[PDB]
Every structure is written in C-alpha cells, then in structure tokens.
Swiss-Prot record:
The gene is Mief2. The keyword Transmembrane applies. Belongs to the MID49/MID51 family. The lineage of its organism: Eukaryota, Metazoa, Chordata, Craniata, Vertebrata. Does not bind ADP or other nucleotides, in contrast to MIEF1. This is Mitochondrial dynamics protein MID49. The keyword Glycoprotein does not apply. Interacts with DNM1L. GO terms for biological process: mitochondrion organization; positive regulation of mitochondrial fission; positive regulation of protein targeting to membrane; regulation of mitochondrion organization.
Length: 329
C-alpha cells in the first residue's frame, strides 16, 4: 500500500543525514563570515547588514542541501528616502517585481546616499547592483584562500549569482545564492531581491515571498503537529526525480501546499498519502487551466511562463495520482 512506499521514498530520497546537515550549515556559516569580512573591508561606504545564511537547509530539518542555500546581504536604506513601487504599476507591468524609488531629491539630492551610485534615473537598479557584486565575487574575492582555510573548494558559477561549494569531500555538495535584499513590507518578512531576469526590467527587484510562506507553513504545522512542510519536501524530491517535472520547483509546490494546507483537514502522517495525492490532483487541475497563482501574491501566475507543450507534458507525467500512485516514486 501507498503509505509504506511513501515513507520508504521519504526515508531514501528526501531525509538528509544529520552529519551532512550540520556540516553544510558549518561551511555556509563560515563562508558568510569570510565573504562579509571582504565586503566590509572593500566597501565600507556601502551599508550592508550582516550576511545571513538561510533557506530550506536552515528552516526545519531535514531538508539538507537539495535546494540552494540563501546568503542574504541586506541593504540598509535611509528611512523615508526610498519608496516601493509594485511592478504591476510600473511600465513593465510585472507583478513578480517591484521598483525602489529614490525620494526627496529636491532637498536631498543625488550623492546624499551611498546607494545613489546605483541609480538608473530615479530608481535604485538591481541590475547595476548585480554587476558590482558579480565583479567582486568573480574577480575580487580570495576564493582559493577561503577554500584552503575551510577545507573545501568554493567558486562562482557561470549564470545568475551562485557560489558553488565543493565538496566537502565528506559526501556533500551545495550552492550558495548570494542575495542582496531590501525589506519589501513593514508588517511581514517578505523581501525584494536583486536577482536577474536580464531581459525586460533588470532595474526592477524580484519579490521574494519565501520568508512569509515558510512562516505560514511553520505556523500551521505547529498548531496541529501537521505534515504540511514534510509534504512540501516530498513533492520537491519527486519532481526533481523526473526530468519532465523539474520545472516544478520549491515556489510552485509551496503554492500547492498552501492551498491544501490552508484547510482544517487531516494533516497527520496517517493522512500524508492522501494529502500527497490531493496535491497531484490540484497540480493536474492547475495545469489544464494553466494557472497556479501565488498564495500571497495571486496576480503572479507561477505557470505563466510555461509553454503549452511543457504544461501538457507535465500533465501526462502527473496522471498517476489516484490511478497508479507508486508508479511515480
């Protein structure tokens, strides 16, 4: 029966050995302090906060390093000198993005803020910020020495802004995503990231709902000892398992679990198999209508940039939910 195979798959392909989790946090934590030391040394005029490692590796166990490890570099913006403009209200009419508008230019002209050098027109440009950090990471940070000090190899990847970590021999590999971030809301912990999409509006920042989403999932599970977050890790592991399903990533499947999870329905381990099948069901339904909106930002459709064949292809792989469920493990 289904429950046994599900637990078995979780045991074999989802759960991460605690030595590897402990080790990964150690390297990522240590890389952050070295990288922070560099940034403070080389750019003391740029008021970044302390680098914060995070992501699924840190937020509950035992996710491990299946996903990227977030390395947050917070910009400290002068209060009231900067204003948020939602991307859907800019000329790029992009709900996934946000603009950061320089304010009070009459009495505080360009140059009053250290961030002004990253201005393109009247907005703080994530793209220009990205260029600066990419250059520092790739040509200005002493990665051979840091690697030597920590007994591993660290090097910048050829796309976006990723730090690849080898190994450390002891059965581990992972990726650090260096994320320059601004606060994006006063009432919760959502962020704006300086992240590429280097077509369209690269001056715009990318909305990051990850902190809000994981707080919600943690909040929900803590009140009924639920398995929502456990289910999200399952869904991720399976989709990584299939070359067709690989585009369905953490953020996509989060939406699925928030939808089901936002109900007073059984979230015990006993019902995990049913919650799982219900998720596949929801996914297949979302696919045929090509709509999977963000729970905390419904105007963004996480399936929007999928081509028709992609969706159709994912659909036929996901067929198995009630009919032949362990065919997919």
């Amino acid at each position: 029966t289904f429950q046994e195979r599900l637990l078995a798959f979780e045991r074999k392909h989802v759960i991460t050995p605690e030595a590897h989790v402990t080790l990964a946090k150690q390297l990522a934590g240590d890389i952050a302090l070295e990288l922070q030391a560099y940034l403070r040394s080389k750019f003391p005029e740029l008021p970044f906060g302390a680098l914060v490692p995070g992501g699924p590796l840190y937020d509950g166990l035992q996710a491990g390093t299946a996903e990227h490890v977030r390395l947050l570099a917070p910009l400290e913006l002068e209060p009231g000198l900067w204003s948020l403009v939602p991307g859907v209200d800019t000329v790029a009419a992009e709900p996934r993005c946000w603009a950061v508008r320089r304010t009070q230019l009459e009495f505080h002209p360009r140059g009053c803020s250290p961030w002004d050098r990253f201005l393109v027109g009247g907005y703080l440009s994530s793209r220009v910020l990205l260029e600066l950090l990419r250059k520092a990471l790739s040509a200005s940070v002493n990665w051979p020495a840091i690697g030597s000090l920590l007994g591993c190899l660290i090097w910048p990847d050829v796309a976006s802004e990723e730090l690849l970590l080898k190994v450390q021999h002891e059965c581990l590999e992972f990726t650090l995503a260096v994320l320059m971030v601004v606060p994006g809301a006063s009432t919760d912990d959502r962020l704006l990231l300086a992240w590429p999409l280097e077509g369209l509006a690269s001056n715009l920042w990318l909305q990051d709902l990850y902190p809000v989403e994981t707080a919600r999932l943690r909040a929900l599970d803590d009140q009924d000892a639920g398995t929502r977050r456990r289910l999200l890790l399952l869904l991720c592991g399976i989709c990584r398992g299939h070359p067709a399903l690989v585009r369905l990533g953490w953020s996509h499947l989060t939406q699925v679990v928030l939808h089901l999870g936002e109900e007073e329905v059984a979230w015990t381990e006993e019902a995990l198999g049913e919650r799982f099948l219900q998720a596949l069901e929801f996914l297949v339904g979302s696919l045929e209508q090509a709509s999977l909106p963000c729970h905390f930002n419904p105007s963004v459709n996480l399936l929007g940039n999928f081509r028709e064949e992609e969706i159709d292809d994912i659909g036929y792989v996901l067929y198995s939910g009630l009919q032949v469920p362990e065919s997919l493990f």
